[PDB]
C-alpha cells in the first residue's frame, strides 16, 4: 500500500492530533507528516514516523502538565542550564566536568525551574535565548509523580530521584531549582529509565557538590498499557494511538 494513500487515509486523525499539541509541536509534526506522505522509501518513511511518534508524545506530555514543548535543536543543555541559571557556579561546574566533558552537553527533554520573585517587550533576538521552562512548584509536580507510583504499571514505568541537598522554605522561593524530565513512548520501557539512571545518579551527585538543588524524572509508556493508565490523560492517548501508532502499524505491514 502506497504511503501517499495511507497518509491520505489517516489525514483526518492526524489533523486532530496536531490540534491538541502546543503550537511549535504542531508545526514540527505537520512537516513530519508531509515528509512521510512524500517519502521515497519505507525506510525513509519509517524513520520520520519514529520521529513523529516521539515528537507528538512529548507535545502531549508537555501539554498535560503545563510545560512548553521545547523543540529539539533549541532544548537547553547542561552547560547552558548551568551558565544561565547559576553564573557564579558556572566556573566551578566547568572544572568538575573537565574529565567528563560529555556531561557538559546532556539535554533533558524537559528542564524545569520554579518561578522566582525576590505585552510590548523585546520580541526579536539575533541569537537564541537559552529557554526557561518555568513551573510553579517543583515539589508539587514532584508530589503528583510520586503518588501516581503508589496508587494514591506506574511504579515500573518510571523513576523519581532527588539530589539530597537541603533547601529552606525561603531557599526554595529565593533560589533556582532544577527538575529534569525524560519522557518516552518507546517499546522497551525500563530502558529509558535505566539508561538515563546510569548517567543521572552521577549528575545529581555533581550538582549537589556544586550547591544546586536538582530533581529528576524518567518515565515511559508503551502501546500495551491500558488507556486509563498512561502518563498523559486517557483522552489524549485516544488520539496518539489513532494517529501515530496506527501509522506505524501500517508501516510494519507493507515493509
Amino acid at each position, epitope marked *: 500500500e502506497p504511503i501517499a494513500i495511507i497518509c491520505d487515509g489517516i489525514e483526518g486523525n492526524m489533523k486532530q492530533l496536531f490540534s491538541v499539541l502546543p503550537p511549535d509541536c504542531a508545526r514540527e509534526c505537520e512537516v513530519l507528516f508531509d515528509d512521510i506522505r512524500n517519502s521515497p522509501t519505507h525506510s525513509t518513511a519509517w524513520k520520520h514516523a519514529l520521529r513523529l511518534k516521539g515528537t507528538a508524545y512529548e507535545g502531549l506530555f508537555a501539554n498535560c502538565y503545563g510545560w512548553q514543548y521545547i523543540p529539539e535543536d533549541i532544548k537547553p543543555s547542561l552547560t547552558m542550564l548551568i551558565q544561565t541559571l547559576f553564573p557564579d557556579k558556572f566556573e566551578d561546574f566547568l572544572d568538575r566536568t573537565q574529565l567528563h566533558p560529555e556531561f557538559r552537553d546532556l539535554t533533558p527533554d524537559f528542564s524545569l525551574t520554579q518561578k522566582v520573585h525576590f505585552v510590548t517587550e*523585546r520580541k526579536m533576538f539575533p541569537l537564541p535565548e537559552t529557554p526557561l521552562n518555568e513551573v510553579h512548584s517543583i515539589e508539587r509536580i514532584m508530589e503528583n509523580f510520586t503518588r501516581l507510583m503508589h496508587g494514591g504499571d506506574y511504579g515500573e514505568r518510571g523513576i523519581v530521584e532527588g539530589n539530597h541537598m537541603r533547601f529552606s522554605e525561603e531557599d526554595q522561593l529565593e533560589t533556582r531549582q532544577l527538575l529534569l524530565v525524560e519522557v518516552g513512548f518507546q517499546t522497551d520501557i525500563d530502558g529509558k529509565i535505566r539508561t538515563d539512571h546510569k548517567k543521572w545518579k552521577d549528575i545529581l551527585k555533581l550538582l549537589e557538590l556544586l550547591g544546586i538543588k536538582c530533581s529528576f524524572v524518567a518515565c515511559a509508556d508503551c502501546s500495551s498499557t491500558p488507556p486509563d493508565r498512561w502518563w498523559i490523560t486517557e483522552d489524549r492517548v485516544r488520539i496518539l494511538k489513532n494517529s501515530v501508532s496506527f501509522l506505524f502499524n501500517k508501516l510494519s505491514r507493507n515493509s
Partner: antibody, heavy 116, light 113 residues
Framework: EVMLVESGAELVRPGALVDLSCKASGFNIKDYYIHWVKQRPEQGLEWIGWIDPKNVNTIYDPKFQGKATITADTSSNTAYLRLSSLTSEDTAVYYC?????????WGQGTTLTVSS | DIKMTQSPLSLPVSLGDQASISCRSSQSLVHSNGHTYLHWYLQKPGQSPKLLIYKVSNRFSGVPDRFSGSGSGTDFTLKISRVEAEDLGIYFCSQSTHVPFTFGSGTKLEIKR
C-alpha cells in the same frame, strides 16, 4: 577583535539630511542586530532603533519614527543611520552598538552639530 | 517608556573602598521568557560606554571580578568591591527588556585623593 567605526557628516545645516555609517570589523553583522543610540550632555543616553541585517526588519522608538531610518549593507558590512529634518535637538553624539540579545560593544561615536 | 532611575547621582569613594550603585525601574524588567534585561555600562571620560554586567549579574568578558551585579524585579544594585583609580567615569544602567530601551541618567564615580 570586535570594533564598530562610525563616520558621518560632522556638520550640516538645519532642515537638511545626514547619513551616518557604522563599519563593523571583527564580525559579520548578518549575525547580530545593530542599534543606534544618541547621547547628549543633559538629555542623556537615548535609544533610537535597531536593524536586523539577516532579513532587514527595523524597530524604532516611536519618538524617533520619521526622524530616523536605519538601513544596512551586509556586503560592505555597514549599517547606516539617516536623520532627516535636522534641528538643534539633533546636535548630539551618535553611536552604533552590537546586539547579541543585549547591547555589548559600542563604537567611538560620531559628532553631529546642526547649524549654518 | 520604562523609566530608569539611578542613585546617587554622584559617588565619591576612596581607592580600595566599596561602591554601591542603585538602579530602579518603572516596571518589572522580567521578560516573559524568564530572563531580566538590565545591564551596567561604564563610560570613562571621553570614551564610549563599555559593557560591564549584562542581565543583572553576568560579568562581561575581560571585566574584573570586583564588579558584581545584583537585583531582581525592579531593584538592582551594582557593587565595586575595591574601587580603583582607573574606575573613574559615569555608570549607566539600561533595560533591554522593553522597546524602547532606556538608560539611567548616570552615576558619576569620583575618586577621593
Amino acid at each position: 577583535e570586535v570594533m564598530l567605526v562610525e563616520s558621518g557628516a560632522e556638520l550640516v545645516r538645519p532642515g537638511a539630511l545626514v547619513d551616518l555609517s557604522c563599519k563593523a570589523s571583527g564580525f559579520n553583522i548578518k549575525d547580530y542586530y545593530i542599534h543606534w543610540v544618541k547621547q547628549r550632555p543633559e538629555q542623556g543616553l537615548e535609544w533610537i532603533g535597531w536593524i536586523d541585517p539577516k532579513n532587514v526588519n527595523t524597530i524604532y522608538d516611536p519618538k524617533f519614527q520619521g526622524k530616523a531610518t536605519i538601513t544596512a549593507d551586509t556586503s560592505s558590512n555597514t549599517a547606516y543611520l539617516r536623520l532627516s529634518s535636522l534641528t538643534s535637538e539633533d546636535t548630539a553624539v551618535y553611536y552604533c552598538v552590537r546586539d547579541v540579545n543585549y547591547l555589548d560593544y559600542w563604537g567611538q561615536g560620531t559628532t553631529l552639530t546642526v547649524s549654518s | 517608556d520604562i523609566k530608569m532611575t539611578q542613585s546617587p547621582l554622584s559617588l565619591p569613594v576612596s581607592l580600595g573602598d566599596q561602591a554601591s550603585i542603585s538602579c530602579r525601574s518603572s516596571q518589572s524588567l522580567v521578560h516573559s521568557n524568564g530572563h531580566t534585561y538590565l545591564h551596567w555600562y561604564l563610560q570613562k571620560p571621553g570614551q564610549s560606554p563599555k559593557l560591564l554586567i549584562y542581565k543583572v549579574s553576568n560579568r562581561f568578558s575581560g571585566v574584573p571580578d570586583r564588579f558584581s551585579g545584583s537585583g531582581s524585579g525592579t531593584d538592582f544594585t551594582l557593587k565595586i568591591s575595591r574601587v580603583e583609580a582607573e574606575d573613574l567615569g559615569i555608570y549607566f544602567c539600561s533595560q533591554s527588556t522593553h522597546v524602547p530601551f532606556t538608560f539611567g541618567s548616570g552615576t558619576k564615580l569620583e575618586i577621593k585623593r
